[PDB]
């Protein structure tokens, strides 16, 4: 004759003090592209945020302003391959997260939930991310 709240609390009381094991999960579960793409949306999200906050902190704390550090880098006469690779590395997370962000905002409308459509929009995100990155790093 127990309520759901009492059943929940009894479950944690009983199990957290027991000798029972927690069954494995991350180490045993099989991968999918949607899953790997969900992790990557979190990782690029956090990476973009932390990079945006580093920029902001360098704005408050570096001794010189932005055009100096640009002139510094231009004077290094770096190779086009090294410029292109750096640009690509910089825009790729922004690109991934933006398109996959769009795919999320579609989901929030209730569209695209059939599993085969989850696979299609994933791959569509991958190719738009690759195309936009390569093109923007060539600008």
């Amino acid at each position: 004759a127990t309520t759901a709240k009492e059943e929940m609390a009894r479950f944690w009381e009983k199990n957290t003090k027991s000798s029972r094991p927690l069954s494995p999960h991350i180490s045993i579960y099989k991968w999918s592209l949607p899953m790997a793409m969900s992790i990557t949306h979190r990782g690029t999200g956090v990476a973009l945020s932390l990079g945006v906050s580093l920029f902001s902190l360098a704005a408050l704390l570096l001794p010189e302003q932005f055009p100096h550090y640009v002139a510094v880098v231009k004077s290094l006469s770096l190779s086009p391959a090294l410029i292109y690779s750096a640009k690509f590395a910089l825009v790729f997370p922004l690109s991934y997260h933006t398109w996959n962000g769009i795919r999320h905002l579609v989901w929030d409308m209730g569209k695209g939930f059939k599993l085969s459509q989850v696979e299609q929009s994933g791959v569509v995100v991958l190719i738009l991310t690759l195309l936009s990155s390569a093109a923007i790093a060539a600008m």
Partner: protein
């Protein structure tokens, strides 16, 4: 309100959409207006998003309050520095152009 949780979910999506719209606005009409709107949206979107990460992964009343208080400090300092950069330096849109001309 007692609809706090779904008003938040809706605001999250509203702000994400805003930020999407700022990316063409930054490439097309770069300037003070887009600079400060990017400052606001970038900080708001990142703040809410990192708070979902904390809600998911951090447990216990004290670690939760500590994580979240540090997140306000990170966000408040982030918006402050981006406005600083927009007022005293060249601003967001111009900075990206200059970087991309390297």
């Amino acid at each position: 309100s007692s609809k706090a949780a779904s008003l938040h979910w809706t605001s999250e999506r509203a702000v994400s959409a805003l930020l999407l719209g700022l990316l063409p606005a930054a490439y097309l009409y770069p300037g003070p207006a887009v600079d400060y709107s990017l400052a606001a949206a970038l900080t708001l979107h990142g703040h809410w998003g990192l708070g979902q990460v904390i809600t998911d992964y951090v447990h216990g009343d004290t670690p939760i309050k500590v994580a979240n208080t540090g997140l306000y400090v990170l966000s408040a300092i982030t918006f402050t520095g981006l406005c600083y950069f927009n007022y005293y330096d060249v601003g967001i849109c111009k900075a990206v152009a200059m970087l991309w001309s390297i």
